[PDB]
Design a binder for this molecule. Structure first.
Ligand SMILES: [Cl-]
Ligand SMILES: [Cl-]
Lengths: 145, 137
């Protein structure tokens, strides 16, 4: 999700000023009416868990909603762990570990690990998965608005 | 936009359903108040000139604004040429606006070392036009 580095290579760049500016304008105008969801969805396209947490933490006010969001995420992270049984660790030493709920929510994973899952073949789309949990939470919250 | 395929090459990714759905919604609610501009800036993030043209051609109604936008783009393109004289090939104004350039040439400029950021350049002209149009609304 892309910027050119010094080596001439196209690599991931974190959620941009332009993207965040639009997100804050959407929050100011729409949080958390139903119209907020399509806008969140398009603005978070390509986002890592780290970018998603920036988005969640740039919401001013709405303390009740953001607390429901946090409850939703914690429950989905717990159910993800339950429904995706893993071995203790990778069988082959250097191989990429499978992400847990807390990796998807970005509390126990680094940006490099996130990008690693996202660009795996086949992808392990931890951004899309976290977004789904966030949209689950939004769909509960829109009832307040 | 542009994405890296399993071979490590940069290729086109079409504008996603979710992006194009949000841009339509922005147009329906905001075209062409000043509020449309930051939404356009974000939703066009990483757009090739081809994607930019897809976004512009999605705008239903506002045909007078779109005609003025077109005129602005044409003028910036002719100026670009004059300010960037030439003898892979460097883009001309019309290549930056997507009318004479292929999708592959656009990606090739955008990912060149250093980049010739034809998407960002075309966005700048579009925004110049949107800033004129805002005065009609
Ligand atoms: Cl993802
Ligand atoms: Cl560009």
């Amino acid at each position: 999700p892309i910027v050119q580095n010094l080596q001439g290579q196209m690599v991931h760049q974190a959620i941009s000023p332009r993207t965040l500016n639009a997100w804050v304008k959407v929050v100011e105008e729409k949080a958390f009416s139903p119209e907020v969801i399509p806008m969140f969805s398009a603005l978070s396209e390509g986002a890592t868990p780290q970018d998603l947490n920036t988005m969640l933490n740039t919401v001013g006010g709405h303390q009740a909603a953001m607390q429901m969001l946090k409850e939703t995420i914690n429950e989905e992270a717990a159910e993800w762990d339950r429904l995706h049984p893993v071995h203790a660790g990778p069988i082959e030493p250097g191989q990429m570990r499978e992400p847990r709920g807390s990796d998807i929510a970005g509390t126990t994973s680094t940006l490099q690990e996130q990008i690693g899952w996202m660009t795996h073949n086949p992808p392990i789309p931890v951004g899309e998965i976290y977004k789904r949990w966030i949209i689950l939470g939004l769909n509960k919250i829109v009832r307040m608005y």
